[PDB]
From Swiss-Prot:
Top-rank taxon: Eukaryota
Tissue: Expressed at varying levels in several tissues, whereas a smaller transcript was expressed specifically in testis.
Originating species: Homo sapiens (Human)
Domain Bromo: 9-113
Assembly mode: Component of the BRF-1 ISWI chromatin remodeling complex, at least composed of SMARCA1 and BAZ2B, which regulates the spacing of histone octamers on the DNA template to facilitate access to DNA. Within the BRF-1 ISWI chromatin remodeling complex interacts with SMARCA1; the interaction is direct. Component of the BRF-5 ISWI chromatin remodeling complex, at least composed of SMARCA5/SNF2H and BAZ2B, which regulates the spacing of histone octamers on the DNA template to facilitate access to DNA.
Family membership noted in the UniProt record: Belongs to the WAL family.
Protein name: Bromodomain adjacent to zinc finger domain protein 2B
UniProt subcellular location: Nucleus
Gene: BAZ2B
Lineage, opening ranks: Eukaryota, Metazoa, Chordata, Craniata, Vertebrata
Purpose: Regulatory subunit of the ATP-dependent BRF-1 and BRF-5 ISWI chromatin remodeling complexes, which form ordered nucleosome arrays on chromatin and facilitate access to DNA during DNA-templated processes such as DNA replication, transcription, and repair. Both complexes regulate the spacing of nucleosomes along the chromatin and have the ability to slide mononucleosomes to the center of a DNA template. The BRF-1 ISWI chromatin remodeling complex has a lower ATP hydrolysis rate than the BRF-5 ISWI chromatin remodeling complex.
Residues of the whole record sequence present: 2054 to 2166 of 2168
Amino acid sequence: SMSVKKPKRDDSKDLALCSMILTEMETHEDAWPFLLPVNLKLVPGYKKVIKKPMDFSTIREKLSSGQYPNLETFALDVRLVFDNCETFNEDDSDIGRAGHNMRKYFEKKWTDTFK
């Protein structure tokens, strides 16, 4: 509350550490469905159904231009990529399986880097 703060967690390395995580997501072999925005002219249904499209390249631009106020807003966008994927893709598809794999990979890196 006012003049009453928990001890200051060091957040000065977060920007760099989120960048490294993102690099590792970008270079994973199952990243291909997620590297670029879904083409809304060429994929019927996507525009109407997925209210908030997100992809790695868009997260990378937001990161690089100070549009994440803190590390939680960064994790929310990464998770949004996989939640979108689950909304549009059958579990038993290459893309559906890619999303489950990438989400797992991300969540471990997140816990190991920050928890």
